[PDB]
Amino acid sequence: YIYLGGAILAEVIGTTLMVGTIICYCASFWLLAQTLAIAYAIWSGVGIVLISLLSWGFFGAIIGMMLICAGVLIINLL
Amino acid sequence: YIYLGGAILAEVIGTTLMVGTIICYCASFWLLAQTLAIAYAIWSGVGIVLISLLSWGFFGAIIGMMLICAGVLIINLL
Question: Could you give the subunit structure recorded for this chain (chains A, B)?
Answer without folding.
Answer: Homodimer. Forms an antiparallel dimeric structure. Also forms dimers of homodimers.
